[PDB]
Design a binder for these strands. Structure first.
Ligand SMILES: [Zn+2]
Ligand SMILES: [Zn+2]
Lengths: 167, 100, 73, 92, 53
RNA sequence: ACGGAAGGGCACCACCAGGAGUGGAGCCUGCGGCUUAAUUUGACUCAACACGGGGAAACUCACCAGGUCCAGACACAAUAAGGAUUGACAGAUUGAGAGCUCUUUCUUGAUUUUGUGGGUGGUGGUGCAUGGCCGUUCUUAGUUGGUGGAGUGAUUUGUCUGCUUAAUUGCGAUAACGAACGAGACCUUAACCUACUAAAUAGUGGUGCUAGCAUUUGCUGGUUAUCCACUUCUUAGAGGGACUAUCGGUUUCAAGCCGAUGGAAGUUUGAGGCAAUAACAGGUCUGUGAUGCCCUUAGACGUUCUGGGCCGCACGCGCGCUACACUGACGGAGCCAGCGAGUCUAACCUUGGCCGAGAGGUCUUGGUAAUCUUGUGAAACUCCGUCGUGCUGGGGAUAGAGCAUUGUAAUUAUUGCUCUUCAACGAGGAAUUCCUAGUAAGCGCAAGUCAUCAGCUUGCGUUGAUUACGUCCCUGCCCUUUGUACACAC
């Protein structure tokens, strides 16, 4: 009934908002990303991630209640939604996941140089072409500064960075 | 039967392999058609500032959403119709059919 | 954010809070007789034979019809 | 906070039925979807339930999402006088 | 009291607000999403809006 | 790093050359100061001042006069169903049927309330504690590692004399070798395709139906169910195409440079996007339920209600619009675009036709869109006339009266229409801005804000010039050499 313009953008913000939800709540579960596939009478949400049974819950208790929550939120009907999960291979090739793991290491209280050396070691032995991480803020100090850790070559300009790099 | 199928997407190559398997299905089942009526593409433009606050120099960014729309008018009996509908559901692309 | 004398006059006057009065529900006191009713209750069909019509001064107040039963009997 | 036990236990039976809740962060509305009680009453009941810690919570674009726990479901089970494993809102 | 929110908000900037941060300036009504330009600039590519020129 | 030191190369945020201008008048709008109850505030060279998407009636809103409400969770103890507590009509009260509060007796009854901590809220402070984002240094070409070599070492070479390039781009030269980032590459758009895919949501022609004139054959037209065919225009898709091709000079004769021909296109084809290392004690805690620390937290700096306010004017600055008239104003005619947005559980765009001078009103219609608004019949323009060089039919602030619309509310007139009043201003001073091609400039147009309000901005197209093809003289940039009592670094 509504225009396809606002249809599409509502689908876009729909994706964005549920992505915000899921990178919030499934953050400690090795989240990476999600994908609705539209269907007649149905719509489906894989979650590319690592800790699969953890996001499921017992007999999928967690995913069931998540379906109920998101459905009640978006005023969908029951049965309109199905969720799945995907133990993605090459865990190192997911900037979001590696950053989240780094975050939990930090909150645990791990040495940050140690952590970053370890993370980029893990990436480049997972078999990337170039890795990069960076910190900025208060760091064993009272004044702002940064650090950096990297190896291999990278790029900064072009459709190459629009496509190849994960950020 | 006089249906009109249409697609309203942005993912170009997705839409196009969709249209290709669509049309070859239609022609191998030997059903009448028109071609893929390719509408003019519509670019949704949003032009605003990069800067969240007010200061710094003035600098404008223009984000784009490129929309491609296609449609064909068809005739075919109900069984081939519904098989065509329940097949060729490729994700990312938006679809709808009408009749009369 | 330091200059505020509250030059308005002193008016911290939180209203009465349903003051703890004595017993209520004085239907009547009929010793050796059937206890009849005082504070003739409102004729609202909502009323369940225990809503005392207030009557402050020649004006009746229903509490079931929480502001509306005005008569002069 | 002053709320009728009517509305509080309406929310409770809603919870034990469903297993999840969502609320838009709009006071002055006083009309929760799916529950004819007040938006604010819902949200503040949930605030209390969180402060005692029988429910987990998130904002996520200002729609106040809440989800139940095991202490929560057994608490509601005995609150509403149900048997063990009566009918939680997280069935198979 | 029933006049706790007496004033009308049938139009204007008190009516509109962002769906992300409930802010009342920088709002982007175009195409009906009503987000601040800041958050929108943060969310554009994951939406699908993108830079070409 | 700096240099009123040198050498070379560079840029219209730099000059010459010129074009239009600004500063001169008026007016819109921002900053300052001043006033005031408040006239919240942030930002102050470039790199703050039509910037905060900031076109404020209310809201926003952060400010002022004031009136409320509590959303003070959780834990401890307490009050306490002989009632913890909530609410109340009518009068008084108060702008205020805010019981806000009081008179008052009623309604309700474990939800509260009381106090102790304890958490929250905060457009409250700190942007010099932060992140993130942005801007800028910096649109320029520059930045770095490994291994070797020099040096006790800071460090250096690699990263270069020279030549060339928009370019540390290349030729090459060479205690350096080999690599990476940046640039280029790449992406988008603009242009070419009578070649492929095609199509009443785009057109073309023809057929039939049909109007006029000519009638002679025809010309100009209307006709979605009259159909037939095509896709040049129209779209989009895949693709091709220019790479400096060729030619001629010039050049160690190498990179490459100039010219000419051809070519849609021969300044990296044009314009953008993307856009490195290091850095600022740049801006922003007022975009962020991101925020540390502090402050506040119930006669709250929280929230809400009313009325003002952010515009207040003795004065100074910055953006822009109007003009200073014949290359014109006015009245008639002709009168051609493109970008782009649009109603669903709402009331957007609105066509038609009726009324009204007009604004506008009216009942209808179509549209979720190449489909209808719309061929947006835009303006400028062109053709005709009125005018006459006259602070004059230039120009239209300034004011008055009336008429409609938006909105709960228009009062310091929202805005629009009509009549009347018709002031400075005769080309702008010291100074200063932008600019080399469809660019400037003129022209209007949509979108953003948005209930209504453009003199704002972002984009669109329409008409369309002169003046250079250079230099470092000013202002600054890049490399190298040199000097230095410089390092929060002239
Ligand atoms: Zn009654
Ligand atoms: Zn926002």
């Amino acid at each position: 009934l509504i225009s396809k313009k606002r249809k599409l953008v509502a689908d876009g913000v729909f994706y964005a908002e549920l992505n915000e939800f899921f990178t919030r709540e499934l953050a400690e579960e090795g989240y990476s990303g999600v994908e609705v596939r539209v269907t007649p009478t149905k719509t489906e949400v894989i979650i590319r991630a690592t800790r699969t049974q953890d996001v499921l819950g017992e007999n999928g208790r967690r995913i069931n209640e998540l379906t109920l929550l998101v459905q009640k939120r978006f005023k969908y009907a029951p049965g309109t939604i199905v969720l799945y999960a995907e133990r993605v291979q090459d865990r190192g090739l997911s900037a979001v996941a590696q950053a989240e793991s780094m975050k939990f290491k930090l909150l645990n209280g791990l040495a940050i140089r140690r952590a970053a050396y370890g993370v980029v070691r893990y990436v480049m032995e997972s078999g990337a072409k170039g890795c990069e991480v960076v910190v900025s803020g208060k760091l064993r100090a009272a004044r702002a500064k940064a650090m950096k850790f990297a190896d291999g070559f990278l790029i900064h300009s072009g459709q190459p960075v629009n496509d190849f790099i994960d950020t | 039967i006089k249906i009109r199928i249409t697609l309203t997407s942005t993912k170009v190559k997705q839409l196009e392999n969709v249209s290709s398997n669509i049309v070859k299905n239609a022609e191998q089942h030997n059903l009448v058609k028109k071609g893929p009526v390719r509408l003019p593409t519509k670019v949704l433009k949003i032009s605003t500032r990069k800067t969240p606050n007010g200061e710094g120099s003035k600098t404008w960014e223009t984000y784009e959403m490129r929309i491609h729309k296609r449609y064909i008018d068809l005739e075919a009996p109900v069984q081939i119709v519904k098989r065509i509908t329940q097949i060729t559901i490729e994700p990312g692309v938006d679809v709808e059919v009408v009749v009369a | 954010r330091k200059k505020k004398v509250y030059t308005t006059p002193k008016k911290i006057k939180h209203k009465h809070k349903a003051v703890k009065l004595a017993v209520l529900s004085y239907y009547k006191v009929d010793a050796e007789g059937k206890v009849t009713k005082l504070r003739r209750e409102c004729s609202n069909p909502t009323c369940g034979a225990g809503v005392f019509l207030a009557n402050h001064k020649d004006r009746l107040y229903c509490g079931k019809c929480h502001s509306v039963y005005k008569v002069n009997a | 906070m002053l709320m009728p036990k009517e509305d509080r236990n309406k929310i409770h039976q809603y919870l034990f039925q469903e297993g999840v809740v969502v609320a838009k962060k709009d006071f002055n509305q006083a009309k929760h979807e799916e529950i004819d009680t007040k938006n604010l009453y819902v949200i503040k009941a949930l605030q209390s339930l969180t402060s005692k810690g029988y429910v987990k919570t998130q904002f996520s674009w200002q729609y106040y999402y809440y989800t139940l726990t095991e202490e929560g479901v057994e608490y509601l089970r005995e609150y509403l006088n149900l048997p063990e494993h009566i009918v939680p809102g997280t069935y198979i | 009291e029933n006049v706790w929110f007496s004033h009308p908000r049938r139009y204007g900037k008190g009516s509109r607000q962002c769906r992300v941060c409930s802010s009342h300036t920088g709002l982007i009504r175009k195409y009906g999403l009503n987000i601040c330009r800041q958050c929108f600039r943060e969310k554009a590519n994951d939406i699908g809006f993108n830079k070409f020129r």
